[PDB]
Design a protein around this ligand. Structure first.
Ligand SMILES: NS(=O)(=O)c1ccc2c(c1)[C@@H]1CCC[C@@H]1[C@H](c1ccc(O)cc1)N2
Lengths: 9, 237
């Protein structure tokens, strides 16, 4: 989840 | 895709340019308690993970992957990557681990946390090995990228994806050999050194698995709270 956010930024 | 048509020198440059910064520990630095050392490391690892995620995006081939696959690789590799970074930074400090410039710990400070000194010893042994081998920065960045691409590849069409990863991995192998050939190593020496480097990755995997056990063991004991991101990454194992 957080990983998904950070991977898209 | 882009990564496959890069020259060896272009690959190395890209990887060097992608390197995350070295971060500082919180300065707030007396003799350490179990909870305090734990707190420092946890906080540091969490901050490091953010930079690693952004580093990964700059590794040629990585963004070519689907989001699901990028996630899988990072979940599989993150602690290995932190560890090889730590070991690299610690090379110029025999007998010590440079967690940050303001957090350089010796083996006996590993005893502050229960079950930590085992992992410390393994990390120190790895640092010695890199020193004995005279590991170069250009080799290091290659190895770090191999860990990212390799560590989750066997546990995923998710076949053309695997193939791409294996093609990128092949490119990094070419890049490692290139560097060795440029350094004037004989053919024999090149294949020997390549083997020696890749065999250390088995030990790094082992350290990661032990460290993951340790980390899950500290979660259960709730001795300090872990960040949301660390817990997310830990849950993935
Ligand atoms: N004691 S803990 O608070 O459970 C805890 C928290 C974070 C971490 C650990 C352990 C393990 C123990 C050895 C280092 C390792 C790790 C770490 C931290 C920063 C790095 O650049 C590399 C690795 N993170």
């Amino acid at each position: 989840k957080i990983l998904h956010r950070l991977l898209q930024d | 895709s882009l990564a496959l048509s890069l020259t060896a020198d272009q690959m190395v440059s890209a990887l060097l340019d992608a390197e995350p910064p070295i971060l500082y520990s919180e300065y707030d630095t007396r003799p350490f308690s179990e909870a305090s050392m734990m707190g420092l490391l946890t906080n540091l690892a969490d901050r490091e993970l953010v930079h690693m995620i952004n580093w990964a995006k700059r590794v040629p081939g990585f963004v070519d992957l689907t989001l699901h696959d990028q996630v899988h690789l990072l979940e599989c590799a993150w602690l290995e990557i932190l560890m090889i970074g730590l070991v690299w930074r610690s090379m110029e400090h025999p007998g010590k681990l440079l967690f940050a410039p303001n957090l350089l710990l010796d083996r006996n400070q590993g005893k502050c946390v229960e079950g930590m000194v085992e992992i410390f010893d393994m990390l120190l042994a790895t640092s010695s090995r890199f020193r004995m081998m005279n590991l170069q920065g250009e080799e290091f960045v290659c190895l770090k990228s191999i860990i990212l691409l390799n560590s989750g590849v066997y546990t995923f069409k998710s076949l053309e994806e695997k193939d791409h990863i294996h093609r990128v991995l092949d490119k990094i192998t070419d890049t490692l050999i290139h560097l060795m050939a440029k350094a004037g190593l004989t053919l024999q020496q090149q294949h020997q050194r390549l083997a020696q480097l890749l065999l250390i990755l088995s030990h790094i995997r082992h350290m990661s698995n032990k460290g993951m056990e340790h980390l899950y063991s500290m979660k259960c004991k709730n001795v300090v709270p872990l960040s949301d991101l660390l817990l997310e990454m830990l849950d993935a194992h």
